Design a protein around this ligand. Structure first.
Ligand SMILES: Nc1ncnc2c1ncn2[C@@H]1O[C@H](COP(=O)(O)OP(=O)(O)O)[C@@H](O)[C@H]1O
Lengths: 452, 17, 220
């Protein structure tokens, strides 16, 4: 028997129900076979030549997909947007009336019938991009153990004493300012503390914002960008996942944007889970207003590489799995770990040696006390990583040319020389900004600097 | 320290019936 | 290999616009996804690197930056050698001076024209830069020399040679043609400050240490 189909709208006490069919609404009567109360809103029903509902099927699975905008206060209708940026108000189906529907979800809808039947799952990549993988542990950083303990004291201490603060009616400090030398491992401490915080609650987000690129000089747009960043931070804090907001290169900036930043910090102070971490290499240039007691009370000073850390850093980079030359193994009876340790000690000692190969910088003063800085100074974790990469490249070149695999100290020395030659340019044009960049680390203003 | 005025660029859009 | 030329057009930035604002995210996501593949390499070129947002240039996706500096005297000699080939006809007057040694004549001509172009003659003055604290700075043509200008110099010299063989009937090429091409190119580019680039001004400011106050085009 030829039987049509339609979409149920609502029920009535008179055992009659409204059905949308063929583009028009009709008030059909329910057959005695079916139970009127058993019908669900939005359920597809079967019609016949006499326009009587006798059977009820499932929900439709094909049609237009619309993005949900909001849910109305009545709890039965939702406002969505169509494919052509056309917004509509459509009734929700029974299955849609834990799980909680959220704005941005994609829903199957029928514009003619004005019903939404199902939710189509979608995977967002913005959350993955915004956060970072907590892959930086305490062991991943070396030579900063006291910094690690200071960060632990500043961050994890209130968590174990939250009830103490609640009884005492106080506000734990959530402001940590990491100030130290030219970018070496300053941001890596932020990754380490984020990973450690993720470990304790056993999902993790890290919002990194640079300083110079944030500036929107023309008219007040930088305040708008900061407000947007803090609104995103609040949205992330809505979810029960710790979020760390990190600001990098904040010495470039600071009647100005400082009051807006202070207001946003005061607003986010209520969210104690969010941790604000700022980095700046020039504590003198930073306006003391942000350093006032309250928000950013905790300040942590970092440095470089105590030589041992460089060795620790080399061990982290030049692990035991790297190939080793047979001739160098002959000096250590085939003990790979001992050979690696001795090679690291040798290269670190040579790098921090006052020799003719360390003429990187020549420093002149007002009295003319021309001295020479060596490779020990200005050493950095990024520079050591680049040295390791260049050494690996040189070892690969030697393998493909000579044919003998392994690692040699000559590769390390060549990588050191090439990387110092490369690094002679990026921080040191020596007319601008170098005077302060060397005077802050040394402790006295330098009239003239030259590169040898 | 100056203000700007915007010129729009219309995007293609077409529908049937 | 995917070659993104003139990366100023797209992927530049999103904050300053005065959808194009929705191009960087999907490109970055796709590059991150394809990073796992060993044989996929992305190459980009751009005149103005400042307009490109650092997000795509962060370590990871775009981890290699290569700066192509303006040629120097040796680079100019190499470029001229790459273009002043022995296959071009050479006039008998210059060729006889080397007893038919084409290579010696060509390399001597290349050295002569390189020395002429890079010389600090009063005719080679191009720009005057004013500094508030300092006295002043003088910039010559050599500070804005490039391989394309060398190619155009060679082309103009060859055009002059063609006109000479049409007007007098003597085939070949002469050093006078190269010198005339050099001086004509310098006069032609004297008026336009087009040779200057934001990178050049940044380098000049980082050399002197003081911001520029005024730029003047010297002319006789
Ligand atoms: N103790 C360390 N152990 C391992 N790697 C380190 C250490 N210190 C610094 N590094 C390396 O130095 C690099 C510096 O990265 P980043 O912090 O983003 O730049 P900057 O140092 O300029 O802030 C990091 O990629 C990190 O791998």
């Amino acid at each position: 028997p030829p039987s049509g189909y339609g979409v149920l709208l609502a029920t009535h006490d008179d055992d009659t129900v409204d059905v949308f069919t063929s583009g028009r609404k009709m008030r059909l009567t329910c057959s005695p076979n079916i139970d009127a109360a058993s019908l669900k809103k939005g359920q597809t029903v079967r019609l016949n030549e006499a326009l009587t509902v006798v059977e009820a099927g499932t929900f439709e699975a094909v049609g237009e997909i619309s993005t949900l905008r909001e849910i109305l206060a009545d709890g039965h209708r939702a406002l969505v947007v169509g494919h052509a940026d056309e917004e509509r108000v459509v009734w929700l189906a029974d299955p849609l009336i834990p799980r909680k529907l959220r704005p941005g979800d994609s829903l199957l809808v029928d514009t003619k019938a004005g019903y939404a039947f199902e939710r189509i799952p979608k995977a967002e990549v913005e959350d993955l991009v915004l956060e970072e993988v907590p892959d930086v542990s305490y062991a991943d950083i070396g030579g900063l153990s006291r910094q690690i303990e200071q960060i632990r004291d500043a961050v994890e201490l209130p968590f174990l004493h939250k009830e103490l603060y609640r009884e005492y009616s106080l506000r734990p400090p959530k402001g940590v300012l990491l100030y130290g030398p030219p970018g070496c491992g300053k941001t890596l401490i932020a990754k380490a503390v984020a990973n450690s915080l993720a470990k304790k609650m056993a999902k993790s987000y890290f919002l990194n914002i640079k300083g110079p690129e944030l500036l929107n000089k023309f008219v007040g747009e930088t305040e708008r960008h900061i407000r947007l960043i803090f609104q995103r931070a609040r949205e992330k804090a809505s979810e029960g996942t710790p979020v760390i907001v990190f600001f990098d290169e904040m010495d470039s900036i600071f009647t100005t944007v400082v009051p807006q930043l202070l207001s946003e910090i005061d607003g986010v102070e209520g969210l104690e889970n969010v941790i604000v971490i700022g980095a700046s290499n020039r504590e003198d240039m930073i306006d003391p207003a942000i350093l006032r007691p309250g928000r950013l009370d905790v300040k942590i000073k970092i440095e470089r590489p105590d030589a041992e850390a460089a060795q620790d850093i080399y061990s982290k980079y030049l692990t035991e799995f790297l190939p080793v030359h047979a001739d160098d193994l002959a000096e250590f009876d085939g003990d790979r770990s001992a050979c690696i340790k001795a090679m690291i000690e040798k290269v670190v000692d040579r790098m921090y040696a006052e020799i003719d190969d360390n003429r990187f910088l020549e420093v002149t003063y007002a009295n003319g006390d021309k001295e020479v800085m060596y490779f020990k100074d200005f050493n950095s974790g990024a520079m050591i990583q680049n040295v390791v990469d260049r050494a690996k490249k040189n070892a690969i070149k030697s393998v493909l040319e000579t044919g003998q695999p392994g690692l040699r100290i000559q590769h390390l020395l060549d990588s050191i020389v090439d990387e110092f030659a490369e690094n002679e340019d990026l921080p040191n044009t020596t007319n601008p900004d170098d005077w302060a960049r060397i005077s802050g680390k040394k402790g006295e203003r330098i009239v003239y600097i030259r590169t040898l | 320290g100056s203000m700007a005025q915007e010129q729009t660029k219309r995007g293609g859009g077409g529908g049937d019936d | 290999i995917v070659f993104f030329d003139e990366m100023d057009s797209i992927f530049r930035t999103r904050g300053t616009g005065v959808v194009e604002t929705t191009v960087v995210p999907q490109l970055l996501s796709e590059i991150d996804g394809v990073e796992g593949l060993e044989n996929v390499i992305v190459i980009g070129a751009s005149n103005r690197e400042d307009m490109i947002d650092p997000a795509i240039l962060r370590p990871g996706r775009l981890d290699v930056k290569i700066k192509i500096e303006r040629p120097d005297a040796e680079a100019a000699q190499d470029i001229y050698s790459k273009y002043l080939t022995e296959f071009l006809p050479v006039h008998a007057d210059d060729l006889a001076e080397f007893d038919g040694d084409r290579s010696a004549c060509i390399k001597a001509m290349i050295e002569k024209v390189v020395d002429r172009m890079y010389a600090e003659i009063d005719d080679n003055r191009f720009l005057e830069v004013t500094y508030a604290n300092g006295d002043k700075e003088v910039m010559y043509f050599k500070d804005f020399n490039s391989g394309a200008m060398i190619q155009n110099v060679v082309d103009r010299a060859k055009k002059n040679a063609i006109k000479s063989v049409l007007e007098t009937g003597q085939p070949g090429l002469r050093i006078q043609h190269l010198l005339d091409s050099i001086v004509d190119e310098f006069a032609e580019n004297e008026d336009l400050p087009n040779t200057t680039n934001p990178d050049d001004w940044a380098r000049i400011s980082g050399k002197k240490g003081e911001r520029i106050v005024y730029i003047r085009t010297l002319v006789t």
